[PDB]
Each structure stands twice: as C-alpha cells, then as structure tokens.
UniProtKB/Swiss-Prot annotation, chain A:
SMART domains xrefs: RNA_pol_Rpb6 (SM01409)
Biological processes per GO annotation: bacterial-type flagellum assembly; bacterial-type flagellum-dependent cell motility; cell motility; cellular response to cell envelope stress; DNA-templated transcription initiation; intracellular iron ion homeostasis; nitrate assimilation; protein-containing complex assembly
Cross-referenced SUPFAM superfamilies: RPB6/omega subunit-like
Record GO terms (molecular function): bacterial-type RNA polymerase core enzyme binding; DNA binding; DNA-directed RNA polymerase activity
Domain of life: Bacteria
The protein's name in its UniProt record: DNA-directed RNA polymerase subunit omega
Swiss-Prot record, chain C:
Name the record gives this protein: RNA polymerase sigma-54 factor
Composition bias, Basic and acidic residues: 1-9
Region (Disordered): 1-14
Species of provenance: Escherichia coli (strain K12)
Domain of life: Bacteria
Family: Belongs to the sigma-54 factor family.
Function as written in the Swiss-Prot or TrEMBL entry: Sigma factors are initiation factors that promote the attachment of RNA polymerase to specific initiation sites and are then released. This sigma factor is responsible for the expression of enzymes involved in arginine catabolism. The open complex (sigma-54 and core RNA polymerase) serves as the receptor for the receipt of the melting signal from the remotely bound activator protein GlnG(NtrC).
UniProtKB/Swiss-Prot annotation, chain E:
PTM notes: Acetylated on several lysine residues in the presence of glucose.
Domain of life: Bacteria
Subunit structure comment from the entry: The RNAP catalytic core consists of 2 alpha, 1 beta, 1 beta' and 1 omega subunit. When a sigma factor is associated with the core the holoenzyme is formed, which can initiate transcription. The rRNA transcription and antitermination complex (rrnTAC) consists of RNAP, NusA, NusB, NusE (rpsJ), NusG, SubB, ribosomal protein S4, DNA and precursor rRNA; S4 is more flexible than other subunits. In pull-down experiments interacts with CedA. (Microbial infection) Interacts (via flap domain) with Escherichia phage lambda antitermination protein Q; this interaction renders bacterial RNAP resistant to transcription pausing and allows it to read through termination signals.
Organism per entry: Escherichia coli (strain K12)
Record-given protein name: DNA-directed RNA polymerase subunit beta
Family to which the UniProt record says this protein belongs: Belongs to the RNA polymerase beta chain family.
Biotechnological applications: Co-administration of salinamide and rifampicin or salinamide and myxopyronin suppresses the emergence of resistance to both antibiotics.
UniProtKB/Swiss-Prot annotation, chain F:
Residue numbers carrying N6-acetyllysine: 148
Protein name (Swiss-Prot/TrEMBL): DNA-directed RNA polymerase subunit beta'
Binding residue positions for Zn(2+) 2: 5, 79, 86, 89
Gene that this polypeptide is encoded by: rpoC
Its job: DNA-dependent RNA polymerase catalyzes the transcription of DNA into RNA using the four ribonucleoside triphosphates as substrates.
Subunit structure of this chain's protein: The RNAP catalytic core consists of 2 alpha, 1 beta, 1 beta' and 1 omega subunit. When a sigma factor is associated with the core the holoenzyme is formed, which can initiate transcription.
Species in which this protein is naturally found: Escherichia coli O157:H7
Family note: Belongs to the RNA polymerase beta' chain family.
Domain of life, source organism: Bacteria
Amino acid sequence: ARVTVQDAVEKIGNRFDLVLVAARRARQMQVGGKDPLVPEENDKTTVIALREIEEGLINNQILDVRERQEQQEQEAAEL
Amino acid sequence: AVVWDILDEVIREHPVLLNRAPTLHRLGIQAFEPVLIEGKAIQLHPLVCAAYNADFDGDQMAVHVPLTLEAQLEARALMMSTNNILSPANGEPIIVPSQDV
Amino acid sequence: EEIDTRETQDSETLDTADALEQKEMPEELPLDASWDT
Amino acid sequence: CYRILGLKPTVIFADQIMYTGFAYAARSGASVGIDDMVIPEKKHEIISEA
Amino acid sequence: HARSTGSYSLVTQQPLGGKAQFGGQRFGEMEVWALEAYGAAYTLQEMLTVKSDDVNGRTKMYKNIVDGNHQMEPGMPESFNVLLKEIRSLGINIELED
Amino acid sequence: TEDDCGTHEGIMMTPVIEGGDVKEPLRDRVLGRVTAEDVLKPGTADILVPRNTLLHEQWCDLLEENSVDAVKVRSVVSCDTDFGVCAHCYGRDLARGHIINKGEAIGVIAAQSIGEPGTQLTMSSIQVKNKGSIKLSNVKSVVNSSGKLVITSRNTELKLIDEFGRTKESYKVPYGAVLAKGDGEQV
Amino acid sequence: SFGKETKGKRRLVITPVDGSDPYEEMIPKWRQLNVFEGERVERGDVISDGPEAPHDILRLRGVHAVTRYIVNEVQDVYRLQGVKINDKHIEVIVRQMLRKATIVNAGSSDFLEGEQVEYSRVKIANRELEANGKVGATYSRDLLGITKASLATESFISAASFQETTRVLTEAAVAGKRDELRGLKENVIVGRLIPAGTGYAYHQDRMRRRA
Ligand SMILES: [Mg+2]
Ligand SMILES: [Zn+2]
C-alpha cells in the first residue's frame, strides 16, 4: 500500500484492474462521502482504498453489489 | 508559518515523477514520495542512479506532479521505484550496489 | 528578393544503415532532444 | 533473496546493504597514494631485451 | 525553477519555455514512449490535455483541485484545431466525422 | 490482446555452442517461456515437463538434473492471434516475474530494450578437452591407404557427447579431412 | 549438372527426379563452386561459399530458420560487448518485419494474381473459406526492412506524424481515406486514452457500443 502494492495485485490479479478499482473506491470515499472499512491512520483516500483491497474487503463485484443495494434502497425510499 | 504546516500536510502521500533526459528506456521516469528539505537541489537515492545513468557532477532533473486520483494510483502502483526492481530487458536486478558500498 | 534553391532535402527514406555509414553529422537530430542530451 | 522470499524483503535488504557498505567503507579509511602504484623491478630488463 | 500556472502562447495556447518566461518543462516523444511502456494511460492523458492546451479543462481542473475533487474532464487540444485550420487553408477538405 | 491462441507451433531451443566453447546454456534461453510440446526424459518415453508450462527456476533446475538438450517453446512469430499476440506465446513479464497481462504495449518495450544498449556498441585441427563419445553428423567417408578414414562431405559435424547425453563441443570437419580416430570409438 | 558452359555465365542445371528439369541458374564463372555433376543436392546447399541473404533463407527453409538466423546474428553482435538482451524483443521486431504476403494463385478468394497484401487478412479469408468446404488461396511470405515495413500503415494521421507530411497528405486527399483512430499515436494526437494498459479496457467498452 505505502511501499509495495504486491498484496493488492495478488488479490485482484492485474495491475490495471487494481488501479481502476482502487480509483473507484477512493473517489467514493473522497467526494462521495462514504466511510472507510479500515481504521484510517492519517492516510489519504488512495492508500485507504489500497489497504481495503489488500484486506479482501473491496473488489469490483463487492462494489457492484453495494451500488445495486444502495440504488434499491434509494428507489424504495423515493416511493 | 502556517502555510508550511499545510504544505507538509498536503504532500504526505502524494508521489512525484522524476525524469532525466535523454529518456532511453522506461526507467528514465520514476515515482517517489517527497521529503521537504532546505536548499535548492534535489536529493536522489544512490541505488537508482544506474537506472537514470546519472552522476553528481552537474546533471539536472525535472519533476512532475500527478493531479487526479487515477494518475496518483498509477504512479504508486506502476511507476514506483519499489516496483521497478528487475530490468525489463533481461530480468536481472537493476538496483544493485556499486562503488563505495 | 528571390534566390534559387536546388539543394537536396533529406527525408525518412534514408535507411538506418546509411545513417551509420555516413561520416557527416545530421542537420537536425531525428531524436526528440537537443544538442546536449 | 528476490527469488526465494519476494519483493518487500528484497527492498529492506537492499537498504540495509547500502547503509552497512557506506558505514564500513567510511570506517576503513581507504585512500590512494603515489606509493600504491608499485612498478615491477623487471621492467627495464624486459624493455632492454625487446 | 518551478511553475504551477502562468502565461500561454497566443497561437498554440501552450505554456511558454524558459526560466526567464516562468515557463514549463517539455514532455517530449521519448517521455510519451516511457509512459506507454509503463501503461499509465491517465497520466499521459492528463499530461496531454489539462496541463498544456485544453483551455476549458485547465479551468475546470483548477476549480476542482481547489474544491478537493481530484477529477478531470478532458477535451480537445487546441493545437489539433490549429492543425485542422492550417490544412484547410491549403485547399484540402479535412473534417471530424460523426 | 488475448490469453491463448491454442496453437501448437514453436521454435526449437538448444544451447548456443560455437566450436568447443559453450556461449549460452539452455537455462538462459528457456527461462520464462511456455513449452509447446511435452518434454520427454531422454532415457524413456516418460513425460518430464507437460504441455503449456511456464518454465521458472524450479523447472530449469529439473531440466538440468535430467540433462535435457533441446526444448520446443512458443514464440510470438508463430502466433495465431490477429492484430496482436496472446499471453502464452509471449511468456514471462521480465520486469515482474509472472506471466504477461493483457493490454501491455510490448512493442515499445522491445524497441526500448534493443535501442538503449546501442550507446555502447562501437561505431587447423580439432582439439578435444573432455572425455566422451564422439558423434558424426552427415558424414560421407572413404578409407585411405594410410589406414585413416577421410571425409567426402562438407556437412559433417563432430559432437562430444558424454554418457549422460549432452553435447559440449561441436566442431565442423571440412571436406577431405583426415580423421585419426574412426566413428564409434572412444577418445 | 553442368549445362551450357561459358555462354556469358556458367549455367548450372538442377534436374529433379520427377520435377522441372529445365530449371537452371546463371552462376558466374568467377565464383568458386563446391558442387559437381555426381552430387545430389537438397534445397539449401551452398553452391558457392559466402554470406547468405535472409530472403533466400525465408524462401527456401521457412520462417523459423530466418528468425533463428536474425536472432543469432544480433545476439552475436551484442555479446561481444557483454550486453544481456532477451530474445523475445528481437522476435517481436522480426514478427513486425514479416507482415506482408504475396499471392501465387487467387483460388476461390477475391484476391488478385500476384498482389502483395496483409498476411492476417489472407489467413482470415482462408480459415473462413475452408470451413465452408471451398478452396483457400496459397501465398508466399515476404521479408521487409523496418524502414520499408513502417511505411505501410493504414492511418494517414499516424503516417503524417513521422513520414513526409506532404506526400502522405496528397495521397490521402486524392484517395479520400478515412481514419478510424485505432492505434496509440492517433489517440495521443487527439488527446484520448491509448488502447493499452489502464486505458485498454475502456476502448473495449467503446467497441461494445460501436458494433
Ligand atoms: Mg554528469
Ligand atoms: Zn499465441
């Protein structure tokens, strides 16, 4: 995360997909106003996203499922 | 005196790109984490000079700042010096010690 | 004023081997760099 | 080290190697003098024979 | 010498060169090749548009950075439009399709 | 732009040996490549290395133990992918150590790897050294009155092969040469 | 066999057992040959000693032989200076050199008699025709230098970037070409994401909305 991203690369399996997923999560945390799943210790959103990815708590499928659930809750509340 | 604290806060985890001309291979541009120093010269790690083909007798380097989150994550995950340990041409290590070490 | 111009102009067709064959130095560096790098 | 253990141990090992090498190179006091370029005593004989 | 923003050329709308003009550093073809070999597409795109001659992109990027939103909206470089006008001035019809 | 084209073609890799000196061992020529055929043990018909195996250091050590001499591997020249190549015909990413990922600009990498070191380039008898069997390749010979068999072929190759089966010295015996020792003997 | 002698050049005639006997070559009489009438030869014999051109190697032996020759020669040049370069890179350069192919007979394909075209198109057409029980065209590979091989690109923006701009622009205007912006340099010029690395996936999505 800070010095080496090898664990995140192993978790995802491709450096380019890792960059894309981490950028999506970091933008969710930064502008989207979400909350981190790991204890943020004076870290930027990019490093927090990388640490979440290397911990198994964030990947593309998880982001898709969370997005669909949030959309369903939003449309149920808009009723 | 508070803008210096702000500046030390904004560069905490924000890579910069160092480049030396001519760029013959892709190891001529690399990414580093900045440490603020007093003076006017850029300090370079002794183990990366061979990748830059650089020596300390008058050479100059250029520094670039990535702006968006994607660029910062590319700098950290692709162009960081701690990822570019092996040589893309032959696979041998390229951060090997030399001279005084 | 107008003056005659008939000097040959170098192009890309000059093969790589011919570049090393020639003893002379190129008018403009093909490489995107100055005369110090 | 890289082939057996991985990436991060290699980075730590390289940093430690650099620090130790610099420290002990400074401690050695290795210098250069004019008497270090010792010339063989047979040079003039060989040149005379040639 | 360092720069954040400054004055641009009138025709090409790109940063000037030299310390005396408070100019920027040139990012040539070989640096582009290095970025291509790394695979850093977003770094190269941001280097090509919002840092040199995407006139609206520069302003939007500056505003977003001040607002704390690190995201860009790239557009068309101005030098390509200049090239299109110059090729049209030769009597050749070149146009962007669809 | 692809994972695997499924082709079965490939080039044959042997150590680069000129004269009696070995310049490139087999380990340095197949490391990180993908085999196109099953590598059989020289003694028997038993499979040593299966199909489509990325030869890392462990497999190179295994090949060294069993004394294999020629291996067939996949190359990008004989790749069935159109408008690009596949990951298996390329092999290992030399800068990372694993297999190459899809979407990599390998042409620029190759051009830089060939061009960067270009700043450094400048602008009558057979004597064996190791005991072992002697193998003659493409030899046409006739017996001379002197009792020494002479050669009537240009394409004769002399190979020094030990009991294990590795060729260590390969010389070229010209036309009309006089051989002090006959084929099938031990020197 | 030795045919007509001293008739301008030493004519050497190779007679196949059941092939085209009248095939012959006008070998210069100054050249020192190493062949006789009583020697049966196979394609690849060194009739006269000397360095060999890679075109003959490609035509007679095949692609693998010329690839091996080029790789070995380049590595021989590089090893004298103690430089280590993997053989992958030379192989991709060679693959870029072997891009064209010449038709020897049109067959069922709509190709001409002897036009030089792209190899990928020919192989695609042949693999399509063979699946329908028809007959595909046969061809012969061509070998081009890098300077000649890089001048046969299908994009006038990219070509005008690094070739003579006037010639490329005139030819494109007369032909009326259309550029699809498919390569790296084309997307660099218009400030788009290159179809490689972190941008590669993006382009695929675009290609899903295009077709
Ligand atoms: Mg210097
Ligand atoms: Zn393939």
